[PDB]
Amino acid sequence: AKSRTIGIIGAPFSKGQPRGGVEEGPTVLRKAGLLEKLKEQECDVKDYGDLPFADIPNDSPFQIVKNPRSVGKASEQLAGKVAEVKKNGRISLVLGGDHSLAIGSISGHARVHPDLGVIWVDAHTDINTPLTTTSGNLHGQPVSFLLKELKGKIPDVPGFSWVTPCISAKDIVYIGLRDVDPGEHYILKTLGIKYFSMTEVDRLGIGKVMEETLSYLLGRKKRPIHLSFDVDGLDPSFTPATGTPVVGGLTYREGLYITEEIYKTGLLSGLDIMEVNPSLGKTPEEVTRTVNTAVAITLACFGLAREGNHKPIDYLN
Amino acid sequence: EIVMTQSPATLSLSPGERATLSCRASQSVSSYLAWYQQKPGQAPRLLIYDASNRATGIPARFSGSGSGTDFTLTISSLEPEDFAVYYCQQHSLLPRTFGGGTKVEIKRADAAPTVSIFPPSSEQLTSGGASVVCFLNNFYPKDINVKWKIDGSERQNGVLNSWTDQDSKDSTYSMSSTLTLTKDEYERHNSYTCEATHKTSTSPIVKSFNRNEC
Amino acid sequence: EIVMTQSPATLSLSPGERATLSCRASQSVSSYLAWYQQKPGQAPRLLIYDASNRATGIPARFSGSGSGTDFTLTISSLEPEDFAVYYCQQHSLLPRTFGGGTKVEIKRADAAPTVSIFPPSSEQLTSGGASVVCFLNNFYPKDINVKWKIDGSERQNGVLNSWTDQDSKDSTYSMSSTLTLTKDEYERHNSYTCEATHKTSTSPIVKSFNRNEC
Amino acid sequence: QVQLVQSGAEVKKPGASVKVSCKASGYTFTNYGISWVRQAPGQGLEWMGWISAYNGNTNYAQKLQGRVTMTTDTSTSTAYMELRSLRSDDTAVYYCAREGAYGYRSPYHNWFDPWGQGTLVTVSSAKTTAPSVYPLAPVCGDTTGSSVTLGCLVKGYFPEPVTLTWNSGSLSSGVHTFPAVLQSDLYTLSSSVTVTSSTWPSQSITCNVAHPASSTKVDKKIEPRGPT
Amino acid sequence: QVQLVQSGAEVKKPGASVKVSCKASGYTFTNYGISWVRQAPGQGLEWMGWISAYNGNTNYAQKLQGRVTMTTDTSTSTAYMELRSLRSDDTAVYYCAREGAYGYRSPYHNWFDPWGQGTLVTVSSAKTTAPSVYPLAPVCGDTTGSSVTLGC
C-alpha cells in the first residue's frame, strides 16, 4: 500500500545522552522481531541495516554541549540514509538510539518532503539551545537546530555546518510534555508552538488531543507526518528501561491511540523510536515490557489497530 | 557487567621517564571511563574524567587516551609523589565496575632482608600462648616465601604475614612472619626455623633458635 | 506443584507381552499429561501427548489411558528397541513436574558376577596414590553390595561404583568398585578384600590379594 | 524438520553463566513457546522456566527466580537461558523444548515435541588436566582362573570425557567401558575392562586413553609381572 | 569547597546496620547524585549503589539488593546508606562519591569528583579488649650480628 511500506534504518548511536547503553537500540528492537511482526500484515519491509557510526577521537566539546562532532557526523550520515530511503518511496522508520539522531532524521526527511509536520511525542520539549542548556546533552537539543525561527540564536556548533533549519514553529506538535526547562518553556511560549502537555492531555482526553493535533497539522493541507516518538513520553510503569524517565506519563492505551490515529490519516511518512535503553531495566522483565511497548507502538503506527485487521478475502470458506 | 582489566598488575619505575599504563574493557565503553589515584589510606583522587582532559587540578603530566576498548594513562614526568595505586573506572554501563589496581612501586638495586627471629616471651608462657615471629626488614622487591618447621617438619595454618608499604627513603619493604603456637606445642620442640627466600638470597636463609636457648 | 508418582520404579520384561505402566497424580490433571522415551544419552522422545492419540511417528503399540488421576502406558508388542527410561509429564498445572523414571530393563536367567580384583600399579606407588578396584563383570540383576576391609575391618568413604547400562547381547551388568587409598595406608596392610554379594551368590564372594603378592 | 539445535558443551567454575542457545527451525516461531528442563545424571528431570515467544513471558519456577533469566532472539529464532550464582549441584544436561505459547491465537500444544539434543553443563572449579593411567593387566598371565580379567585405570582428568579404545579399537569383545565418576577433589575417574582367557599370552593389549579437552593421549602398553 | 563529610567509624557485630551519613556541602544538592563504593583492604573497589537526589532513584547492584537501602535527607544535604544481614566479608572502607543525577536538567557528570574521606567499617562479633604485649628485645644485647633487631 501507500502507507505501511517500511524502510527500516537502524541507528545504534549513544553520544548525545550520558547513559551508555542505547547503542543496543536497534539490536534489541530487531531481536524482538519487529521485522517479522511487521511482515504478517501487508508491509514491504526492507531492512537497510544499522549505520556504521565512526568514533571521532578528538571530540572536543563546546562550552556546555558535549560530543558535538560525533552527533553532527551521525546525523549527517543518518540524513543521507533517510533521503536515500525516501527516494525509494518508503516510510523512513528510523529507530535508535537517542533523540540526537532526530536532527538528521527530520533533515533527511525534509530533503524529500519540504512541507512535513512533526508530531514530537516526548516527555520533554528537547528544544534547548547550545546557549540555554544546563546538561549540554544533545538528546535535549534536536529541535532547536531544526526550527527556522531559531536561526540566529544557535552558535556554529562543530559538526553541524550542514544543518539547514527545515520546519517552522507552527508545523510541530508536542504531545506528552511533563518535564520542561525554564529556557525550554520560554522558547515554547515565545515561538507559539502548539504543544499538548499532560495538563491538556488530562483535560481534553487523548481523543480530543489527537483530533486537535491532526486538525492543526492536516487541517489546512494534506502533508507528510513525521512521528518522532520517544519512549520516556510514555509512563515509566510501561517503559522503565529508558534514558530519562519522568513519572506521570501517557498510558500505553493512549500511546497506541496516538499511533492509530496517525495511521488512519494515511499520511505517515517517517517514524522515529528513540531513547530505548535495555541496559537500564532493573530486571530483564522491565526491559521486556519496554521493548514490547515500543514494538507495539511501531506496529500500531503501521496498521495494527487494536480492533483487529483482516486481509480483504472471504474467511468463511 | 563489564570486567575491566589492567595489564600492568604491578609496576616499578624510578623517578624519571614515562610509565604508560593499560586498562582494557570487555566491551566498547567508548571514551566514557575515568582514572584514579588512591594513595594508601586515602580517598581515591580523580585523575582523568572521560579518557582525557585532565580533571581540574592535575599538575601537568597525567594525560591519557582511549576510544574505545583498551585505554592508556601516561605519566610523562613521573614525579615520585605519584607512587600510588591507580584505578580505571568504566561509567557508561551498569554496574559500574572498576579496574584491578596498578600499584606503581619505586624502582632500586635489590636489597637483602635482615632475616631475624624472636622467641615468645616468658610472659606469654605464663599466659598459655606462644607467638614466634620472624622479622624480615629492608628488602626489595616484595616476594619472599617464609617456611616454618617443627624442628625441620613444615608448619601450616598458623602463619600470618604483615607487609609494609614501600618506605619513603630506602624504598624497601618489611615483613613479620607471625606464627602462633600453644604453650604445649611450644614445649614439645626446640629448633624453630625461619626459612626465608628472597631474590637476593641465592640460598634460602634459615634463621632458627632453640627453645630456652637465650 | 503436583508430585507425579510412577508405581513401577524399575521394570524387567522379556521381549513379548504387555508391559503396562503407571503414573499417579496428586491432583486431577484430567487428561492433560504426556509420556516420554528418554534413551540413555539421548533427548527424551515424545510418546503420548494428552493421555492417548499416539503422537506423530509412533509405530503401532504405545497406546495409553487416563482421565484423570492414575494413568497407564501400554506396551502391547514390547519390541526390544524400546528398552529406555519412560517419563510421565503433567502439563496443565504449574510448575510442570515430571514423573520419576520407569527403567524398563531386559528380563534373562540370573547371571553370576565374575568378581575380580586388581592391585594399584607400582607406577601409582611412585605417584603417592593407591587405587584398588574390584571389577564385577556380567551380572544380572543390578543389586550387589561390595564391602572393602582393612585386612578384615570394613572400609568407608573411599569406595566409588560405576554401573553400566544393560548390555545389548547378554543383558547383564558390569561394575567397578573404585577404592582409592593413600601410599601410606596402602603400605600399612596387605590383605585387601572385595566382599561381593549377588542373588546368584548364596555366600558372599570375597576376592582378595596381599600387598606385593603378584 | 521441527528441530531445536543447541550449543554448547560449556564448563563454568562457580562463576559466569552458561547462556545456552536453543535455535529453532522448521516451524513458525513466535507462534509457540520454548521451555527448559534440566536433568542431573542418574536423576529425574525438573522443569525450570518457559518463555512464550509471542510476548516475552518469563514464568520461572521455584528455587531459582532469581538465578535464571530467559530471553528470545526471534529475528533468528533462538531462545536463551542464562544463570546466576552457579553451583556444583547444577551439573546437568539442560534440555530446551516447546510448550507452545498460551496466548489466544497460538495453537493447542502441551507436550514438548521439538526436543533439542541437550547441553552438557558441568559446574566445576577444577583445572583442565591430563589423565593418569595406572593399570595392572596380565598378558594371558596368571591367578588360577581361565578367564583373565584385565583393565586400565584412568585417574585424575578434567573435564569429561576421555576416549577409551583397546588396541586402537580393534579389541572390541569383552569391552566394558565404565561411566565416569567425579571425585571429592573435583577431578574425574574412569575405567574399562576387557576379559580374555588364560590361553592367550601373546595378545599385546593397549588401552588408548585420549582426553581431547586437555588434548593429551596416553597409549598404555601393559605387561604382567614375574612368575615363579 | 566541593566536599563530602562522612561519619563515622562504627563496628557492628553481625547485627544492626552501619547507616553512614555522607554530608554534601559547597555544590548544589538535588542537582547531582551520590553513589557508594566499597573497598576491602588489600583489594579492589566495588560500586554498590547510586541514589539520584533529584528523585530518589535507588538503582542498586548485584549480590546485595536486598541488603542495601539508600536514602536522602536533602533539607541538610546528607545521603544515607544502610545495610542488612551483616557479615564478616563486609569489612571495608565505604566511600561515597557523586555520579551526578541522570535526569534531564542535571549537568554532565560521570566521574566521581567530590570524594568523601571514607568510613572504617569492620564487621566483628569480638569484644572490645586490651592488647597483650609479649616482647623480646635485647638492650644493645647479643646473637652475633652488629645490627640489633628488636621489637614488641
Residue numbers in the entry:
A (entry chain A): 3 to 319
B (entry chain I), C (entry chain E): 1 to 214
D (entry chain D): 1 to 228
E (entry chain G): 1 to 152
Per the authors:
Human Arginase 1 (hArg1) is a metalloenzyme that catalyzes the hydrolysis of l-arginine to l-ornithine and urea, and modulates T-cell-mediated immune response. hArg1 is a trimeric metalloenzyme in which each monomer is ~35 kDa in size with an extended, narrow active site ~15 Å deep that is terminated by two catalytic manganese (Mn) ions 3.3 Å apart. Here we report the cryo-electron microscopy structures of potent and inhibitory anti-hArg antibodies bound to hArg1 which form distinct macromolecular complexes that are greater than 650 kDa. With local resolutions of 3.5 Å or better we unambiguously mapped epitopes and paratopes for all five antibodies and determined that the antibodies act through orthosteric and allosteric mechanisms.
MAb1 is constructed on a mouse IgG2a/kappa backbone with a fairly flexible hinge region. In general, all antibodies are bound to the hArg1 trimers in large, asymmetric complexes with most complexes being composed of two hArg1 trimers and three mAbs (referred to as a 2:3 complex; simplified depiction in Fig. 1a). Cryo-EM analysis reveals that the antigen-binding Fabs of the mAbs bridge the hArg trimers with the Fc region nearly perpendicular to the Fab arms. MAbs1-3 have prolonged HC CDR-3 loops that extend toward the opening of the hArg1 active site. Overall steric occlusion of the active site entry channel appears responsible for inhibition of hArg1. Approximately 80% of all complexes identified were composed of two hArg1 trimers and three mAb1s, forming a 2:3 complex, while the remaining 20% of complexes were composed of two hArg1 trimers and two mAb1s (hereafter called a 2:2 complex).
